[PDB]
């Protein structure tokens, strides 16, 4: 098992609604919420289910990233971003295009903190999307930004064999 965590409803933008169980975040502009964990070792896998949201960003941030600055427009933030029909990854304000299978519904995030990688997957189809190589300077927390509809996180997952 990798690090189990929930959304921290205290980290959540006033324009977001975090659910009772702290696993879904909905919109009622960097509308964001963090995982309630800082990771500074090991390998960790979690997924996000996307219920038809056309504007969102899923990723990781140093503590030094200010609240709701989590869409990869600084040096402390890495994010997979849907921008309507356009999917990019963003770190340090660099927008790097990716080409997912249409109707990307379930996204895998594999953080290898020790070896210094953030890998994004189409978890449903077992397609690698992009890997960030990082020499992590600080602990990182998962981050979720959503502009419409909702996201659901699944955490504490084994590192799957159905990916590579």
Residue numbers in the entry: 482 to 509, 526 to 661
Any passages from the paper?
A characteristic feature of the putative substrate-binding site in the closely related homologs MID1 and MID2 is an arginine located at the C-terminus of β-strand 7 (R587 in MID1 and R637 in MID2) that projects its guanidinium group toward the center of the cavity and two neighboring tryptophan residues lining the pocket. MID1 is mutated in X-linked Opitz G/BBB syndrome, a rare genetic disorder that results in malformations along the midline of the body, including hypertelorism, hypospadias, and laryngo-tracheo-esophageal defects. Many of the reported mutations map to the PRYSPRY domain. Some of these, such as I536T and I555V, are large-to-small substitutions that potentially create internal cavities in the hydrophobic core of the β-sandwich, thereby reducing the thermodynamic stability of the domain. Like p53, the MID1 PRYSPRY domain is only moderately stable (DSF Tm of 47 °C), so it is also susceptible to global unfolding by cavity-creating mutations. The L626P mutation also perturbs the hydrophobic core of the β-sandwich and, being located in the middle of β-strand 11, also disrupts interstrand hydrogen bonds. The small-to-large mutation G532R introduces severe steric clashes and would bury a positive charge within a cluster of hydrophobic side chains, including Phe486 and Trp543. Therefore, this mutation is also likely to severely compromise the folding of the domain. The D611G mutation, for example, is located on the short loop connecting β-strands 9 and 10. This mutation results in the loss of a stabilizing hydrogen bond between the carboxylate group of Asp611 and the backbone nitrogen of Gly539 in the β3/β4 turn.
The tripartite motif (TRIM) proteins form one of the largest subfamilies of RING-type E3 ubiquitin ligases, comprising more than 80 members. TRIM family members typically contain a RING domain usually catalyzing ubiquitin transfer; one or two B-box domains mediating protein–protein interactions; and a large coiled-coil domain region, which is involved in self-association or oligomerization with other TRIM E3-ligase proteins. About two-thirds of human TRIM proteins feature a PRYSPRY domain, also known as the B30.2 domain, in their C-terminal region. All characterized family members shared the same overall PRYSPRY twisted β-sandwich fold consisting of a 7-stranded and a 6-stranded antiparallel β-sheet.
